[PDB]
Amino acid sequence: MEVCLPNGHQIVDLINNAFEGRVSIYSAQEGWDKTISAQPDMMVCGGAVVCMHCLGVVGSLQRKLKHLPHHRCNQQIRHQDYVDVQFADRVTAHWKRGMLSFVCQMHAMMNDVSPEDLDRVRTEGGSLVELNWLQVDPNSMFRSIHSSWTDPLQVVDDLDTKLDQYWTALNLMIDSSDLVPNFMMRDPSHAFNGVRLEGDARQTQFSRTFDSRSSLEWGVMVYDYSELEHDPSKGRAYRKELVTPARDFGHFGLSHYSRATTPILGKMPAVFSGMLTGNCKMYPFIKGTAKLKTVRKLVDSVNHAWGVEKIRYALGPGGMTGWYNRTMQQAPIVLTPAALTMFSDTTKFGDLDYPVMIGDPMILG
Amino acid sequence: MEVCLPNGHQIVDLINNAFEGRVSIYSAQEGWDKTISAQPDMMVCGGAVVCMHCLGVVGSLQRKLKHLPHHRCNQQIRHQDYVDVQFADRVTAHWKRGMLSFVCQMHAMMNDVSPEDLDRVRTEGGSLVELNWLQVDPNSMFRSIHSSWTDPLQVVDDLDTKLDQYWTALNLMIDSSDLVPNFMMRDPSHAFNGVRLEGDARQTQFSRTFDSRSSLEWGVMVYDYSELEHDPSKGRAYRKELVTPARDFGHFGLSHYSRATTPILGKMPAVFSGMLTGNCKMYPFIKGTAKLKTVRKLVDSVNHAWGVEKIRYALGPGGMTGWYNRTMQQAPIVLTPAALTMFSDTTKFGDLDYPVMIGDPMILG
Amino acid sequence: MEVCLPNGHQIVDLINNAFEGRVSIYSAQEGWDKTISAQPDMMVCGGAVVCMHCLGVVGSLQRKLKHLPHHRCNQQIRHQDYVDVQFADRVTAHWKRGMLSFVCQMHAMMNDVSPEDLDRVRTEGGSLVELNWLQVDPNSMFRSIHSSWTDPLQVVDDLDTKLDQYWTALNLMIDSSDLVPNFMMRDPSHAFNGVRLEGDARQTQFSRTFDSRSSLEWGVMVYDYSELEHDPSKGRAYRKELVTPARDFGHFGLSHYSRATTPILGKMPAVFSGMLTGNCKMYPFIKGTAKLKTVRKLVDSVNHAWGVEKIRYALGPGGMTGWYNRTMQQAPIVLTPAALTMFSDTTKFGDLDYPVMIGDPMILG
Amino acid sequence: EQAMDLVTAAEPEIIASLVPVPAPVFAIPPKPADYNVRTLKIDEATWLRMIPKTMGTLFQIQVTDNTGTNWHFNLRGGTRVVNLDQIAPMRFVLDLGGKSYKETSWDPNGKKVGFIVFQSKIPFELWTAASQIGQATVVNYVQLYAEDSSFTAQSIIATTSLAYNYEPEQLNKTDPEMNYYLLATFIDSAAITPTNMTQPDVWDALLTMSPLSAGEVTVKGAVVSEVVPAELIGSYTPESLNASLPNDAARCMIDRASKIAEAIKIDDDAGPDEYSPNSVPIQGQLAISQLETGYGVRIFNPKGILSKIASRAMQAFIGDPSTIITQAAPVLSDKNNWIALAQGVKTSLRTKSLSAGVKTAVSKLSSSESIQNWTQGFLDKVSTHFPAP
Amino acid sequence: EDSSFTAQSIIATTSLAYNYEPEQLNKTDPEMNYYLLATFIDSAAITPTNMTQPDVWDALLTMSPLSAGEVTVKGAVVSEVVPAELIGSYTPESLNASLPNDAARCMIDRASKIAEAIKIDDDAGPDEYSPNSVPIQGQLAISQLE
Amino acid sequence: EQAMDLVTAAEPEIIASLVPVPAPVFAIPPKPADYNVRTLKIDEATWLR
């Protein structure tokens, strides 16, 4: 069976889905399911299904096929070159699960708080509640030495709807309280470089990407406001005027701006879309340029794998090497999520006032 | 000269225009003027000229016709098939003349009120003027058993402009003085199903349709506020807060919403288009199912008189019968005017407070 | 080398540019530089390159040509037929040079007041800056008998840019100082027909045209507002109530209205487009029909000299004569700047109370 | 004979080539097309070039033309320009009517806008300073007046056609570093304040482009100097075909296919889903495919079922020959099958020796006979009017 | 994206394509009804407040027939048609609403070929009689006499 | 001769046929059309629900 190599738009789509975790992959062991790890057989890129072994587009969304009958497949592809796509997808799924679980734990503590206690806190200020990070979700594959990326993914359903409802509710409650969470950051770039890092924070090293090469295991990290709470010469009113996230990210009710949290999971920051957008979308703070670098070696192997004339027809003029160079030029534009730049433009208060340390999360009035 | 049937869209439009009573009919004695009754020789359907004796479109509105040329006419068309439609159109025209004469009388009476009297009533409230309903358009068949649709049509010139101006002046005067008429209704449903009837008024029957069988002669039914005058709780201030229509319909000069009267004539309340729509238009609130059934006899005669392929192409799927079934499915949409849906949804005062009976028209404060 | 005739629309564009003194003209001795007067060899008209000796258009700017290409030249084209056009463009250019020098002078004078004196004048109104009208561009043809249209053009750079900057600064300064000028008129029509002239103003004769039949040398016309300062009832508060230009022209920073001075040069007021619209544009108050009438002699010459078929194709219906008549009918449509109608409708101080005389421009509150 | 003339025009072996073909023989005249640069999507198309957003570079520049008029204008951030370098000769006509383009003190109506071409070694995207634009020149400019539009309270710019014809010789490019760009923006001799006008370009306007060259084609996702028809066969997705410009070889292949489609239609008048001589090559191709060992999934399909599928495929081709260029077209997946059928179809036309269908003619004769009867009756009525003595 | 006109947003070009095969449906049950919709699609039920459009049918659509065996007459697909009945049977509105597979359009193409053939055969100007026009004059005279 | 070939290709009997003509016999290759479903009139289209 003659097969077609992928076009550039489909490959960009494949990369986005992999970071997205929305990629459609068919494996004989799991069929179209990707819940349990297996070597990839069929994947969907740019509206089309591709055979991993022959590196050719096996199918399109137009038709439905239970399985592939024997067909021409080169099978000369090295899994090492394309192992990264599968790894990225698995990492993304597990990480998204971890962020949601951490969110559930904090929101649950807030729901448990009795309303009278919250009003008393409003009267006196200070952190409403805290949770022990050292004891927080060690069960996670990132947080378990025994747990592995290869380990089968937990079955997850309805995650997006629950995430959206809980985040909005938590934000609205926090807005009424005017308490300050110490688990969020005005600027994400400050977390990789900006906020002072000391001890374990000094020990912290940021690869700035989810990759096989860099360990993703790291502790929960929070802004240091315990000192201000102890030195209450600073006012709860002063904090609401400035320390409040609305003071830095804009009024949540009145703002479409995204808000940045601390990199609690393996030093991984989370992006939450502004309330005015009307939905909650979660993204780790990782550059798309890294994804482009991930495909460069694969690009060289494919260039050797497929004929130049076929490439000229499929990718059009300039070749796949030219396509990649143009892509290196577009690394800032084609793979960039809008929400990452959607945050409040600037912060008058500044962050140098308070350092970030690995600490139990809390919100303080 | 052989002739062919008009298109289904043209026919549906023709039915809507006919219900508007803007039917264009040609008779040899009166030519295209329908003021004097005569058997129709030709009728205009959707900008097209149809022979009334062979039922064949013979031309279009672009070409004026002064005489009917000798032609190969099937001459199988019975006048009785569409004479009832002619009767309905003539009766509608008589009804429009009655509405116009009634408007002229009310406007003149309102104009006569002296400003000193108006101010004294503004100080006190209560009906400014009362008209004996027995004196309202008695000559018409609507108040005379002797009068018939077969009687000659009253000559009317510039009816629309005069009606719009009078209704507008009346509404502006009522709005400036915050007056309350006993001949207006917030919602159409109570008119045939809602307002409480007294004595013989309970036996009054609203057909909700147009038929020759129902006598069109009846008394004028209106809201009863004699008990309202007796009632201590609803004073001029109470009325200004709720009873005056502007509280429920909005200010006449500031609203697009339509205003409707009690079924003063033909057992039919009248709907006037909102002032901000750019004109005031009065229409009866009637369903079109009857119009569709009235074409049923025409469909059977045509099915006998026309070719299968021609009918399938012109009337669409199901031939004429299929077109009728589909149109019956579309009657809620194709035959229901938006103007029927242009009234304010919100009515604070409510329409079930006082009973409706055949009574003297009046405007009160 | 044969040559082709131009279109009437191209001609209208050429006429507008000629009245704007911005026509692109090429001479063999001076090339494309028109600084030195010479018989034109080529002109750019309505998107076309026209031969000034054979009336031929066969070239475009997209491909540059070092010189007029060797061509078959009719030499039947009389300079006297189009010399007036060259005269108008050159005179307008000299006039622009004079206007610019005058603006620079006013700007410098406006910048010559001590702030304490400036504040005292702002508080009490009265003269703050006055320019000696004799000092305004004395060497120009409009102020010196010696200057002629044939004379070489004064070398100038960024004339439009300098005029715009000075006008903007001057308008902002007057707006801050709330000065009322004796050198501005709300309505141009009064200038030739309305304002009562005094002395030499009575002798002033307005050609209302650009032709070599009228002296263009004249004194600077200004309002005799000396009696206005004399008037007691017109106190600084009273003037701000009605006299201030902000009352008549509006705020320069806050108004879209155009601003016109008195006929300072060549008995011609300068009118600048509203700043809020985007920019200030100054044009002399000239009727388009007169410019077309000047073209009338050349039109007759062309009609005699060119082939009927060629004339019909280039000048359109009615030949050149028909095009001219139709153009005369449409002269308001295509020959009128909108800014003329962009002046403020409301005028409190007015232009007819006081007489106009050749005097020193001044602004006072 | 008309069918044989169609085959002669087709030259199918050339139009079914899978090996290198001389570009001129395949190439045919290009067709002008209209696009809006604001509507243009640069990422999907390899050809489209635009300065990337986020560069945010605005700088005012002034240059004089051959006439010598000096114009002041500023390039601004997010501005896109036609990449003139490598596109060969082109003539462009622009209509900006209906774009509000209103400045606070500047009225768009009566303003002049111009087309500017810059020639320089630095990439226009890589341009960060005024010196980078290099040989930037406004080829043409238009001053126009606008009036109120149909939209309530909305004015509409009058219909316009700013047009310029540009060819490679005028640039005379001798240096690869030198890059040529085309931009649509308001141009004036006087300096214009950037703050008042925020538009990156007037490229958000109706634009008409006429190609002066048809030598550029992209296949396999790659620009190609010479084109292989087999590579062209089934190589463009609908969105990808939309991305492909009129100069793309696929459109030429489709026109050659339309002549071939006409020949196939003359060859076969059989009803849909009915086995025919035309599909015999098709059934054979599928049979060879059925013979082919199936990579991965392998299945066997009945020859009669194969005939039904082939009939459906053939009817689909009759409905749309241009579908052949669709990339990996499931319906049009085999290029060799198309090539073989093309040779077979030419042969069937050549092999054809006076074969025709009787039924349509007999039905026409029957209608003609009834018309003859009608004519006789009319003549009879005429004789009633004008009887033979 | 945002257009050159300020306050105007521009959607990027799309090529959403749906192939409708009735045979792929293989409709057997007449009760079974087939409906086509085009709208933004999400895996999770959408909050009704967020998106209020009934559908995204307010879009420019390019249609390509997947059937070559069906022609439409009087609102219906037809296995056969009467050309004489076809003559002069469409209002401009009906023809404009007709689908690309309409018989009227095919009839018009055939008619244009015939008109071109008649014009090649007859070089007579308007108001000039010819052997191919006088029969029409005779038909009109016979029609008036009839 | 060319005019006669054109007339034969047109098929006068088919164009002027007064009797039923099979759809395959009458029809000729169709062309694509574009529409905006939101702007379509239900009183014109019987192909929409």
Author numbering:
A (entry chain G), B (entry chain I), C (entry chain H): 1 to 365
D (entry chain K): 287 to 675
E (entry chain F): 433 to 578
F (entry chain F): 287 to 335
Quoted passage from the original study:
The particles harbour 10-separate genome segments and comprise two principle protein layers, the innermost composed of 120 copies of protein λ1 clamped together by 150 copies of σ2 (viral polymerases, λ3, are attached inside adjacent to the icosahedral fivefold axes). The outer layer consists of 600 copies each of μ1 and σ3. The array of μ1 and σ3 is interrupted at the fivefold axes by pentameric λ2 turrets which enzymatically cap the mRNA transcripts produced by the polymerase on egress from the particle. Here we demonstrate that vitrification of infected cells followed by cryo-focussed ion beam (cryo-FIB) milling and cryo-electron tomography (cryo-ET) allows high resolution reconstruction of assembly intermediates of a mammalian reovirus, allowing atomic models to be constructed which throw light on some of these fundamental questions.
